[PDB]
Amino acid sequence: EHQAIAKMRTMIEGFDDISHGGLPIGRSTLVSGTSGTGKTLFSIQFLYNGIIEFDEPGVFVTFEETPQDIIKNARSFGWDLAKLVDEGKLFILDASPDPEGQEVVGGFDLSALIERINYAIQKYRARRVSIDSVTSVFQQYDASSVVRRELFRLVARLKQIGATTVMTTERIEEYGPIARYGVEEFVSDNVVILRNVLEGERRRRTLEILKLRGTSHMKGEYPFTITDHGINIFPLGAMRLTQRSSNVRVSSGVVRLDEMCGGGFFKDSIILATGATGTGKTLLVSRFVENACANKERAILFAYEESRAQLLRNAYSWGMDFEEMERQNLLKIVCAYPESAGLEDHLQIIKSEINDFKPARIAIDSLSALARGVSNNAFRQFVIGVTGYAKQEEITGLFTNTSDQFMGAHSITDSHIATITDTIILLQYVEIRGEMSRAINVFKMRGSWHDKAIREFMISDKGPDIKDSFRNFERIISGSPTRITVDEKSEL
Amino acid sequence: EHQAIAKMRTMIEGFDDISHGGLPIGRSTLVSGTSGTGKTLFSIQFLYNGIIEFDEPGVFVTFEETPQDIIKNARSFGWDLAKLVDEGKLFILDASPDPEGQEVVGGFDLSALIERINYAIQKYRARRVSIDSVTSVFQQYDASSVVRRELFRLVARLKQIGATTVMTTERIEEYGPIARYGVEEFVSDNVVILRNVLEGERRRRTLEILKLRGTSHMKGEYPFTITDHGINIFPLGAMRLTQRSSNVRVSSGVVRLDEMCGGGFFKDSIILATGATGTGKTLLVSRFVENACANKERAILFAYEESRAQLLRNAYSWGMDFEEMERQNLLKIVCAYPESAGLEDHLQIIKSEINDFKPARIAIDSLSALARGVSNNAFRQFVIGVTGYAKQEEITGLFTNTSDQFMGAHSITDSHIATITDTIILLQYVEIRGEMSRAINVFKMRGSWHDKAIREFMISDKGPDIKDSFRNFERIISGSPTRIT
Numbered sequence: 001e002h003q004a005i006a007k008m009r010t011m012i013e014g015f016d017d018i019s020h021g022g023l024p025i026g027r028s029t030l031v032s033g034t035s036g037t038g039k040t041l042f043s044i045q046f047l048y049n050g051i052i053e054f055d056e057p058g059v060f061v062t063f064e065e066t067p068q069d070i071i072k073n074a075r076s077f078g079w080d081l082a083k084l085v086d087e088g089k090l091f092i093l094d095a096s097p098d099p100e101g102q103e104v105v106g107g108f109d110l111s112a113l114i115e116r117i118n119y120a121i122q123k124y125r126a127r128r129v130s131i132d133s134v135t136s137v138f139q140q141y142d143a144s145s146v147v148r149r150e151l152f153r154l155v156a157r158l159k160q161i162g163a164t165t166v167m168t169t170e171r172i173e174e175y176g177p178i179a180r181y182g183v184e185e186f187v188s189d190n191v192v193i194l195r196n197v198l199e200g201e202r203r204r205r206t207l208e209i210l211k212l213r214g215t216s217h218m219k220g221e222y223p224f225t226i227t228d229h230g231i232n233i234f235p236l237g238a239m240r241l242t243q244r245s246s247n248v249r250v251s252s253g254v255v256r257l258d259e260m261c262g263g264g265f266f267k268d269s270i271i272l273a274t275g276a277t278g279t280g281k282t283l284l285v286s287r288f289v290e291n292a293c294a295n296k297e298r299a300i301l302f303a304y305e306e307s308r309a310q311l312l313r314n315a316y317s318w319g320m321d322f323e324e325m326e327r328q329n330l331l332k333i334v335c336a337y338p339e340s341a342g343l344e345d346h347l348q349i350i351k352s353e354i355n356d357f358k359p360a361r362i363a364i365d366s367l368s369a370l371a372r373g374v375s376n377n378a379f380r381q382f383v384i385g386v387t388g389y390a391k392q393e394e395i396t397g398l399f400t401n402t403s404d405q406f407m408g409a410h411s412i413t414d415s416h417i418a419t420i421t422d423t424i425i426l427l428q429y430v431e432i433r434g435e436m437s438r439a440i441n442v443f444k445m446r447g448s449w450h451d452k453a454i455r456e457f458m459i460s461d462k463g464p465d466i467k468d469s470f471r472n473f474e475r476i477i478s479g480s481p482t483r484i485t486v487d488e489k490s491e492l
Numbered sequence: 493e494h495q496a497i498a499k500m501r502t503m504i505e506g507f508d509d510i511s512h513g514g515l516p517i518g519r520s521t522l523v524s525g526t527s528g529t530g531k532t533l534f535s536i537q538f539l540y541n542g543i544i545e546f547d548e549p550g551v552f553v554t555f556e557e558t559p560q561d562i563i564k565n566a567r568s569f570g571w572d573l574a575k576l577v578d579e580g581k582l583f584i585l586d587a588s589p590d591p592e593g594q595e596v597v598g599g600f601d602l603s604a605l606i607e608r609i610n611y612a613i614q615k616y617r618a619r620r621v622s623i624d625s626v627t628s629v630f631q632q633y634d635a636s637s638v639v640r641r642e643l644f645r646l647v648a649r650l651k652q653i654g655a656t657t658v659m660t661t662e663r664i665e666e667y668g669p670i671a672r673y674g675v676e677e678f679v680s681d682n683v684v685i686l687r688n689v690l691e692g693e694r695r696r697r698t699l700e701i702l703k704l705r706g707t708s709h710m711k712g713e714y715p716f717t718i719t720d721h722g723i724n725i726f727p728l729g730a731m732r733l734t735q736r737s738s739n740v741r742v743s744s745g746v747v748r749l750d751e752m753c754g755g756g757f758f759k760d761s762i763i764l765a766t767g768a769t770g771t772g773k774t775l776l777v778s779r780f781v782e783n784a785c786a787n788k789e790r791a792i793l794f795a796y797e798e799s800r801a802q803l804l805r806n807a808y809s810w811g812m813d814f815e816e817m818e819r820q821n822l823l824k825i826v827c828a829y830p831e832s833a834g835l836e837d838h839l840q841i842i843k844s845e846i847n848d849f850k851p852a853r854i855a856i857d858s859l860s861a862l863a864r865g866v867s868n869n870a871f872r873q874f875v876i877g878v879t880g881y882a883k884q885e886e887i888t889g890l891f892t893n894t895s896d897q898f899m900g901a902h903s904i905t906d907s908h909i910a911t912i913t914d915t916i917i918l919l920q921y922v923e924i925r926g927e928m929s930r931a932i933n934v935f936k937m938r939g940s941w942h943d944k945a946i947r948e949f950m951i952s953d954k955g956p957d958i959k960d961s962f963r964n965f966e967r968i969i970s971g972s973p974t975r976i977t
């Protein structure tokens with residue numbers, strides 16, 4: 001064809017983007033990675049989605065796992081390949097060794113095997129092929145040279161059969177060689193790499209595309225997650241910056257704060273709250289998530305610091321009954337330690353909840369939690385992720401941070417995430433006469449006017465009470481202020 | 493001959509400059525690189541370009557990728573190699589293995605195949621040749637020593653045929669051996685290394701001319717981007733310091749500000765709008781992007797922070813409409829996440845849009861939005877990338893930056909780029925009586941005068957209202973002044 005290479009939609013969440021459309025039609029795609037990296041899950045989903053959505057039959061070749069196991073584990077994702085097999089949509093070409101034994105199985109092996117597949121493809125009238133672990137075929141007594149030629153013998157004949165193919169290969173080191181004999185990376189056109197990089201004691205999983213001949217594809221690692229719906233990727237680096245924005249306002253929970261923002265927050269606008277531990281991030285989150293229920297709008301509350309109980313105790317002591325917010329089915333609390341998963345994990349989880357319950361507000365208390373460990377970048381990416389989604393979804397997200405140091409916060413981010421957020425509220429203690437009192441400012445609003453006053457405030461059983469600035473002080477921001485004025489009242 | 497080495501032009505964007513002209517004529521060039529770097533593309537473009545600019549024909553000996561494919565993959569770029577092998581200007585030499593089975597045909601090996609290519613050349617009167625994946629030939633059963641002979645046998649056989657050659661090799665370790673059997677390196681007159689380095693879950697293609705027997709060449713790695721129009725290379729080191737400069741002037745969009753700078757900004761200048769988060773860098777941004785329309789000049793506005801829809805929101809709330817602008821084709825908008833491309837890449841996109849919309853003013857709201865998880869160096873390289881081009885291009889660019897700390901920041905830029913820009917505008921807060929009030933202040937201008945004081949300014953529907961300074965104060969810079977009665 002005088003037309004450039006066309007791809008085949010895989011239907012695997014994210015892959016299509018990274019792959020700018022899917023797997024190059026008519027060609028074989030090498031998909032290597034270490035153990036437990038989802039290589040087989042990759043090929044099964046490929047063949048599968050193609051049957052469920054494009055009614056494209058698929059042939060599955062396996063050189064190790066007995067068909068029975070394959071169908072079994074499929075049930076992990078609620079997949080009854082078993083059926084698609086019985087309706088002729090799926091056909092597993094068992095090519096695994098017998099627990100008995102026969103010598104010299106490399107001569108007729110491939111060639112005879114090729115024709116077998118040819119028969120399979122041709123017979124069931126298929127469009128998708130997955131050959132699981134070609135690596136386990138030359139693992140009899142061969143070396144680099146023999147390997148090379150053999151793949152080319154298979155990638156090519158298959159190519160003559162014109163079927164979109166997926167081959168799986170194993171790896172020994174994580175960032176070491178691409179495949180085993182360091183020879184497939186070439187004899188193949190398209191080489192996808194699924195990693196399970198260590199780092200720390202958490203394992204994060206990326207998926208890359210070293211190359212698709214003739215076409216384009218996002219370059220680099222993008223994390224993905226294996227779940228009850230298979231592989232899920234997150235094209236973090238692909239998400240378009242075209243999110244909608246309204247001029248609509250909503251409330252923060254405390255009306256006086258609703259004034260200092262020029263009439264509330266904007267439905268479409270990420271909101272952060274900073275302060276050293278104790279100022280009151282939570283109190284603001286509390287009244288925030290609450291405010292959203294009194295209007296009949298659902299709002300999830302992900303906490304990573306406090307428990308579900310304690311999150312309902314201290315809450316009560318400020319009035320407001322979460323308990324009721326839950327019953328009416330207008331509030332939802334998640335709670336989960338940060339060391340319970342990697343950022344790639346929470347992001348999906350949060351994204352997940354947002355899909356079932358479809359909140360009207362979002363309140364993640366403590367970006368500072370998730371920031372634990374995880375290198376500054378990895379986290380930064382998380383942030384966009386959350387923010388960028390919640391934004392292009394029209395939800396009001398209040399976030400929380402906690403300055404690494406009380407009094408003297410020379411940086412309202414302590415990780416420089418400022419710029420990602422739209423509204424900024426700042427809490428700070430203030431040493432006023434041997435007494436640490438609260439202060440509260442609306443640092444910046446992107447669409448409104450907001451108040452430029454560094455108002456003090458007190459916390460009681462009602463909640464926050466935004467009073468009057470400290471006009472008669474120098475070095476307020478310094479946390480330890482200074483009294484001014486040198487004239488009282490006397491005669492003329 | 494009695495004179496210097498005559499090079500041949502590759503026409504490969506930027507390469508002629510890194511090689512100082514092109515490939516040493518009649519001499520082969522070994523271009524290696526791991527899988528997915530473009531080695532094929534490099535050599536296919538080489539032959540190709542020779543066909544559409546010089547009419548110098550080409551022989552593409554292909555050992556592993558099938559002729560038909562070689563032709564198909566080139567359509568990705570808009571290249572009709574099918575048409576060129578018809579017009580007999582390019583010839584693809586099918587030197588691949590049999591998809592079936594045969595072992596006793598290549599017993600004349602190296603020699604036989606050379607006789608072929610030498611025939612074809614004399615038949616199409618070709619001038620350039622590329623052998624794609626020669627390593628794949630030996631990949632039958634050879635030792636480092638068997639290669640050095642076979643290769644030196646070919647290379648030479650092709651030197652004698654006064655043919656200017658480009659052989660392709662493949663690597664396995666990015667910064668390790670140049671080729672597979674660490675032998676080709678010394679067997680070829682010229683060495684080109686293609687690297688797809690990772691480092692930080694991100695890839696970056698860098699090209700390098702290791703050596704060129706004969707003449708000089710640029711030294712080291714240069715970044716490159718594989719795109720519809722093939723290999724594109726930016727020799728940020730080959731860009732001299734020769735930009736036309738003038739005293740003409742332009743407005744900042746804020747009349748006051750124009751006076752503060754001694755009557756508007758200079759046309760041929762890079763202005764920087766540093767400041768804390770919120771100080772209003774994006775306020776001035778829109779401003780300077782609008783005055784370019786009231787004067788019927790095209791102005792592009794590259795965004796990397798706020799949406800295009802949101803921009804068009806806060807725009808309207810400061811007065812001045814952005815909708816109109818675009819319609820009249822006097823204001824183009826961009827938008828993209830800094831993580832949505834690599835620096836090497838972001839750079840090119842700019843150049844791209846510019847060439848297409850011939851702006852007169854460029855706005856890059858937050859260079860500090862790009863520095864994201866990038867190497868201080870890499871990034872400095874990205875500023876000079878833009879800055880320079882916009883200079884030589886006589887464009888007037890406005891760049892936004894946000895310091896990693898409000899009030900007290902002990903530098904204009906935490907990445908130290910100031911000494912790159914000509915005019916630095918500077919926003920910072922100042923705590924006046926339990927309050928947060930803004931304060932603009934031109935910090936420096938290389939050709940003009942510009943006021944020296946820090947005037948407080950307020951923002952409102954109509955815009956930036958630069959007022960008067962904090963005379964009766966002290967340490968207004970320390971963000972928390974001391975009113976001295």
Ligand SMILES: Nc1ncnc2c1ncn2[C@@H]1O[C@H](COP(=O)(O)OP(=O)(O)OP(=O)(O)O)[C@@H](O)[C@H]1O
Nearest residue numbers: 034035036037038039040041042076077226227228
């Ligand atoms: N429903 C599921 N939910 C969460 N994780 C799952 C689920 N099913 C499988 N996994 C995880 O996925 C992995 C299975 O990997 P998979 O079988 O897809 O391919 P592989 O390990 O790359 O290659 P191979 O098939 O040779 O083992 C397991 O390590 C397991 O932790």
Ligand SMILES: Nc1ncnc2c1ncn2[C@@H]1O[C@H](COP(=O)(O)OP(=O)(O)OP(=O)(O)O)[C@@H](O)[C@H]1O
Nearest residue numbers: 276277278279280281282283305317318459460461
């Ligand atoms: N019922 C109450 N009455 C008066 N003060 C209260 C009451 N509950 C909490 N406080 C005060 O509020 C602060 C608790 O902080 P809060 O619950 O708002 O979360 P935070 O400041 O955001 O985060 P963290 O406490 O984890 O640092 C304490 O410093 C305490 O003095």
Ligand SMILES: Nc1ncnc2c1ncn2[C@@H]1O[C@H](COP(=O)(O)OP(=O)(O)OP(=O)(O)O)[C@@H](O)[C@H]1O
Nearest residue numbers: 211212214215216527528529530531532533568718
């Ligand atoms: N039109 C295109 N647009 C964007 N990227 C492309 C396009 N065509 C190819 N590419 C990219 O360029 C790479 C092509 O490299 P190429 O196939 O030319 O040679 P190689 O990687 O050096 O050697 P080989 O692929 O033969 O093993 C692919 O990995 C792909 O990411």
Ligand SMILES: Nc1ncnc2c1ncn2[C@@H]1O[C@H](COP(=O)(O)OP(=O)(O)OP(=O)(O)O)[C@@H](O)[C@H]1O
Nearest residue numbers: 444445448449769770771772773774775809951952
């Ligand atoms: N219509 C308006 N009326 C009054 N004040 C406004 C208005 N719009 C914005 N502001 C003020 O301007 C600031 C907003 O900053 P702006 O939109 O100019 O971009 P920035 O300061 O350059 O960058 P960033 O938003 O990333 O911090 C807020 O801090 C706010 O006080």
Ligand SMILES: [Mg+2]
Nearest residue numbers: 034035036037
């Ligand atoms: Mg396995």
Ligand SMILES: [Mg+2]
Nearest residue numbers: 039040132133
């Ligand atoms: Mg497997």
Ligand SMILES: [Mg+2]
Nearest residue numbers: 186527528662
């Ligand atoms: Mg290769």
Ligand SMILES: [Mg+2]
Nearest residue numbers: 278281282305
């Ligand atoms: Mg807390």
Ligand SMILES: [Mg+2]
Nearest residue numbers: 531532625660
């Ligand atoms: Mg190649």
Ligand SMILES: [Mg+2]
Nearest residue numbers: 677678679705
């Ligand atoms: Mg030497």
Ligand SMILES: [Mg+2]
Nearest residue numbers: 419769770894
């Ligand atoms: Mg900002």
Ligand SMILES: [Mg+2]
Nearest residue numbers: 419770774797
């Ligand atoms: Mg901004």
